[PDB]
Structure formats: C-alpha cells, structure tokens
Amino acid sequence: MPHAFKPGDLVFAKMKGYPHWPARIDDIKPPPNKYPIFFFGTHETAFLGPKDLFPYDKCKDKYGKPNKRKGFNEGLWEIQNNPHASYS
C-alpha cells in the first residue's frame, strides 16, 4: 500500500541522456508534483516528477549495475552503504 514520496526515499532517477541513476529525495518553493532529487556520485540535484522515480528496493536488481558514466559507480556505493549521509 505505497505512500507518496518523502525526504529520505531512495530511488533510481531517470533524466534524459543518462541511465537510471541512484538518488534520494531531499528536503526543500517546490514546483508542482516535483521532488528535489539528490543524485549520488555526482552530488547534483534536480526537480523531477514521480514518473522519473523508481524505488530502489524494487528496481535495484535491474538498474543497480555498474556503468561507465562519471560518478555512477561511486553513487552505487553511496546508495547501498551510506544513503542518508551528508554529501556536500
């Protein structure tokens, strides 16, 4: 019986030109039905809507796999080993 997305939720996040990326919902004026997403590895943030947001536990078997992009494998590390830490 899923809830809505909340700060601390772990996801993969899909933006264009990039693979599904280990990320978390950050704390926050937020654009309508968009969330502040923190991308592990890159330590960039962006506002994304639920359609681009894939829960970590359900989807990790598919998306949670190494990739050559800059930051990605580090981000895999962060999301599995210390997902709630400070990355700034």
Swiss-Prot record:
Q: Please state where this protein is localized.
A: Nucleus; Cytoplasm
The SS bond pairs are: none
Q: Which residues form the PWWP domain?
A: 7-59
Tissue expression: Widely expressed. High expression is found in heart, skeletal muscle, ovary and testis. Overexpression is frequently observed in hepatocellular carcinoma samples.
Q: Which family does it belong to?
A: Belongs to the HDGF family.
| Subunit and interaction comment | Interacts with HDGF. Interacts with trimethylated 'Lys-36' of histone H3 (H3K36me3). Interacts with trimethylated 'Lys-79' of histone H3 (H3K79me3), but has higher affinity for H3K36me3. Interacts with IWS1. Interacts with H2AX, POGZ, RBBP8 and CBX1. Interacts with histones H3K9me3, H3K27me3 and H3K36me2. Interacts with DPF3a (isoform 2 of DPF3/BAF45C). Interacts with SMARCA4/BRG1/BAF190A, SMARCC1/BAF155 and SMARCD1/BAF60A in a DPF3a-dependent manner.
Q: Per its database record, what is this protein's job? A: Acts as an epigenetic regulator of myogenesis in cooperation with DPF3a (isoform 2 of DPF3/BAF45C). Associates with the BAF complex via its interaction with DPF3a and HDGFL2-DPF3a activate myogenic genes by increasing chromatin accessibility through recruitment of SMARCA4/BRG1/BAF190A (ATPase subunit of the BAF complex) to myogenic gene promoters. Promotes the repair of DNA double-strand breaks (DSBs) through the homologous recombination pathway by facilitating the recruitment of the DNA endonuclease RBBP8 to the DSBs.
Output this protein's name.
Hepatoma-derived growth factor-related protein 2
The organism is: Homo sapiens (Human)
Q: Which residues of the full protein are shown?
A: 1 to 93 of 671
